[PDB]
Write a protein that binds this ligand. Sequence first.
Ligand SMILES: Nc1ncnc2c1ncn2[C@@H]1O[C@H](COP(=O)(O)OP(=O)(O)O)[C@@H](O)[C@H]1O
Ligand SMILES: Nc1ncnc2c1ncn2[C@@H]1O[C@H](COP(=O)(O)OP(=O)(O)O)[C@@H](O)[C@H]1O
Ligand SMILES: Nc1ncnc2c1ncn2[C@@H]1O[C@H](COP(=O)(O)OP(=O)(O)O)[C@@H](O)[C@H]1O
Ligand SMILES: [Mg+2]
Ligand SMILES: [Mg+2]
Ligand SMILES: [Mg+2]
Lengths: 48, 371, 371, 371, 35
Amino acid sequence: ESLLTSRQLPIFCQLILRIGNFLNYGSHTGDADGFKISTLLKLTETKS
Amino acid sequence: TTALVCDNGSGLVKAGFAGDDAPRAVFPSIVGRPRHQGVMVGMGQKDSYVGDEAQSKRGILTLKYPIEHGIITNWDDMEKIWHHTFYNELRVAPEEHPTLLTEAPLNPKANREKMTQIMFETFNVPAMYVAIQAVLSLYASGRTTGIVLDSGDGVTHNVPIYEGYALPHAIMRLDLAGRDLTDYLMKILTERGYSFVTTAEREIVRDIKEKLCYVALDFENEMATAASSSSLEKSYELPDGQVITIGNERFRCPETLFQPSFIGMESAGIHETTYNSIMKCDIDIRKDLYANNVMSGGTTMYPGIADRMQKEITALAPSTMKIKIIAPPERKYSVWIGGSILASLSTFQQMWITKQEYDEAGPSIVHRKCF
Amino acid sequence: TTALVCDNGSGLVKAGFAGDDAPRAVFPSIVGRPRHQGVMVGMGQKDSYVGDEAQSKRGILTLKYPIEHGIITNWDDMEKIWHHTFYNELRVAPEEHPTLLTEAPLNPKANREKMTQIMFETFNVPAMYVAIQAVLSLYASGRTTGIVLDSGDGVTHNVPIYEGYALPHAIMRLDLAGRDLTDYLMKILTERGYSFVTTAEREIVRDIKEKLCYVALDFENEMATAASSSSLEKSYELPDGQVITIGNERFRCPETLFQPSFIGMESAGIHETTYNSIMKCDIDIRKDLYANNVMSGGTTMYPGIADRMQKEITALAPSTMKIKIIAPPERKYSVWIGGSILASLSTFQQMWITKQEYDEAGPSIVHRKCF
Amino acid sequence: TTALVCDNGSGLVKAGFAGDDAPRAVFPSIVGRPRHQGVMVGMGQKDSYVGDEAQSKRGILTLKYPIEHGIITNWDDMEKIWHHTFYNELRVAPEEHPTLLTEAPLNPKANREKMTQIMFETFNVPAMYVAIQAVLSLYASGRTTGIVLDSGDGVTHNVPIYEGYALPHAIMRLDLAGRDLTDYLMKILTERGYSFVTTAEREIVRDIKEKLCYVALDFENEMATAASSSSLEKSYELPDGQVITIGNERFRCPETLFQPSFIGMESAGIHETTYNSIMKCDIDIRKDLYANNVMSGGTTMYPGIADRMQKEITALAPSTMKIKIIAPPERKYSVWIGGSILASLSTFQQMWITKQEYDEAGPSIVHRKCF
Amino acid sequence: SSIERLFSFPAAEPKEITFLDAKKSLNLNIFLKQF
Ligand SMILES: Nc1ncnc2c1ncn2[C@@H]1O[C@H](COP(=O)(O)OP(=O)(O)O)[C@@H](O)[C@H]1O
Ligand SMILES: Nc1ncnc2c1ncn2[C@@H]1O[C@H](COP(=O)(O)OP(=O)(O)O)[C@@H](O)[C@H]1O
Ligand SMILES: Nc1ncnc2c1ncn2[C@@H]1O[C@H](COP(=O)(O)OP(=O)(O)O)[C@@H](O)[C@H]1O
Ligand SMILES: [Mg+2]
Ligand SMILES: [Mg+2]
Ligand SMILES: [Mg+2]
């Protein structure tokens, strides 16, 4: 029910979708309307 | 342009330049962290010792293996291993040299995703390649076909390849190799009263295993000989100056390779794994695999393993056809030698993985490109 | 803003600046009070003489040592010791100078709290650091690894350090040094008829111990030679002009360091403490610690002690490995010299205990900022 | 006849007759040799005090423990211990009474050989048996299966047992028990200034540990509470009448069981040893083992250890599954009590080692007849 | 702008006229290279 009523997680995945769609521009994974659950564990892979 | 061959094995990373015979940089894959307190201010007390420095100063270092059971578990440690093997050992820029790498069979795909992303985002290369270790070992044996039992530090896997076609269903994997033999050797040395509990002591017991252990040709006769006469006892000098003497532990430790019930595993020995790999092949091509039993990995360095292996397969297989064991003396580095063979080929220019392929197809073109 | 190093040892306070070679002010730590009746009015009668003034006029003074076995007992006397070494010996304001104090390991923590409270509230500083003396001895030796046996006047302690890392479980402390040797030298000097009971006579027996005693290479043969022939006997002139002659007491006095059962203590000698400290260390680093035995402290000024330490450890160690006793000629002040090296280190500026940090953390940061 | 149970433990020997619930002769395993000079004539005073006699007169005795980490060091002292418990405490002839012995897992086998040789030659018995202590601890609980964490005075070992069969490969050993906690408590009482250096003082520190120490449920909160207010401070009266007060050392001392890095051991705590012992077993037999933690040993008397054990295991375990810590109140004597249970059965009579079996098979049937 | 500042890349006879396919030529080259 907490996952059903989580409001901040749509806002978070919208921000991650905007950042990823900026990041993978010019690749086949760009212009994505969504992603899987396992994107969150792969967030720390792209390092500065 | 000279390529680089770098087998990132579970035990020791073996790297060097392509087109050569021997790897220039052989060093164990450990990350050593100090567990005590520093009091001496200055002189470059670096917080994480990698490789040979971690081996030399190991008496104050908790040692961690980034590759456990052929799987890269810790990733930052593996990045430190790659940084040391490129910048400190070879001292070459990655952006001007191709880098061949190796991998275990039946690996997870996301492992290949992560290795591709590290080899194209952090350590940028012009090109790179991931190959199966058994395939490169068969290439360094000079034969296109054959069955390879590769036994490293964590994985003993059987792979039969017929005419370059590596059969996927017949590949199997047994999680019993050199580190398990070292842990069992720690366990059985306590019967003689020698205690080895720390990770620093694992290198000493591993050196004992490398220097003194050997595969028995018959186990029960070696029990009878060891219990009867103390002729096979051998002495070893520890780094603190103490001298131990070991008896049957020279051949009870590799016998776990043939009897996994010592450490409590229900699966049988590597011979039954080889034989059950052989029945998974077609009946036409089984004859070629019997005469082409190739070994690789340093767990096959014990100087009684070939005749015992031929005895075990000849007991298992029907005796109507020929059994032959391919055991070259340089089969420790045959993964690296096969990589050096494969890197300097004129055809191999068109199977390179470019940065343009990486940018077009993510870190995922390695699945559709390689086997 | 230069730095002060003030080794507040049990016997001899050694203080000086940072970067200097030899310690500027070396004077014994005694507070002397008059015990007879002053009859001659005027003359500026001090209620307490501190230092060399108490040493010179010692025939009419009860002398008290404020530090006993590295633990400061009388805090007013130690306040007067600090007042003398700042305002009369070095003639420096401590409000414009940092201070490095030395401390024996395994000390009471309330002692460290009280030197923190006095040194930041009575003689308030910009900064102060309390450091272990053995690390300073290894600083002055210049080598990074090594085991350090430091034997002052009250504390004989072993601290082993490998490649910049101390091992706190292998640190051991023994309350047996030169004050107990002075008391035992009195107790064996009563055999020849010479009586010494007062606090002034401790200085005379201490001077006898400094000037005439020596460590025997073999105790039993030296006993047989001194019992047989009167060649080892030596004469010393007292301050009243009388001449004493001592024989075996030249080498029965320091042998308490190798045989502590003379004064009834149960523990074994300093060589056994060194060997047990090395066996308490990890097995890889004992090769470095055998080759780098660093002695320090004024108790090791006896001119036979290095050969005896080498002989005892080479008896105890395995014979496949070299023992080397590092004994510099200036090892009395090596605690001070390594303190002056440490205070001149540019890296050491970041771990000063500031007055700001003392105010924000109470007298409790000295457990966490120091070792 | 009536059998004997003699748990020859590392710190205390618990002997008594079979069929009984209370051990008749519980006495510490020490040998007290005099060190000072006797001046009485009249003889009477022995050269070696054994047991409670050494405890009573401990102020003039060097105390030697014959057993160190479950290994009998001095066999003459342990022979004196056996002679005292056979002839003075229990007062039985050894050659007319069966006698059950206990032994720790993963011992050197020559220790078992020498115990067999002494019990069949010096104190020759009609029969004997050597058995694993954790098995007898489980037999005291009235259950057939479960895991026993036996934490004695030298060895803390985890043994899982399924259907009366102790699984050999999953048994683990940790050389950290009550003597090391006593040494660490002796180390940390110097912070408050209470010095303890003699072997007699180790019994006083052990009595402090027995009467006042306890396992914290949450270690960091107990740090915060003891550092905040003096509520957990408790006072103890010494044999000379001095009163000490200890605070956090009541629960810094048993926390070495859950954090072995306090005394420099690299290995993990007893909860991790329990968990990794259970993951070394098969999955299907795990259902008995989490629900049947049967703690034993004298170190497990601290009155917060069951809840801390349940908390740490339930943190470690998968959450779908019951954790039950069966901590009986008499689990100190559960080795002896279970020995009386096993020795008072008609089914055990065929399992004895007769003298005839010793004569045909040497002192080596104990590796074969006894598991 | 910050993402392009931080996470951007810091990098700003061919024909052999073989009638055979790549597989048999590769097997032949690996077979030839052992000599
Ligand atoms: N001379 C030797 N004798 C016995 N065993 C060896 C010898 N040399 C190496 N080994 C063992 O084999 C392993 C060799 O590593 P290798 O197979 O080259 O890569 P990895 O095992 O890391 O995949 C080491 O872990 C070592 O324990
Ligand atoms: N030449 C000497 N020979 C023998 N012993 C000496 C000599 N000089 C000093 N000592 C002893 O060493 C002690 C000095 O050591 P030190 O570390 O300076 O003590 P502290 O610093 O505690 O005053 C003195 O107490 C003295 O007993
Ligand atoms: N009431 C107690 N509280 C805390 N510790 C105890 C208590 N009783 C015994 N011990 C500890 O247990 C040790 C004895 O354990 P024991 O069960 O005899 O082990 P073992 O049989 O292996 O010697 C003693 O040394 C003591 O330190
Ligand atoms: Mg390998
Ligand atoms: Mg001194
Ligand atoms: Mg016990």
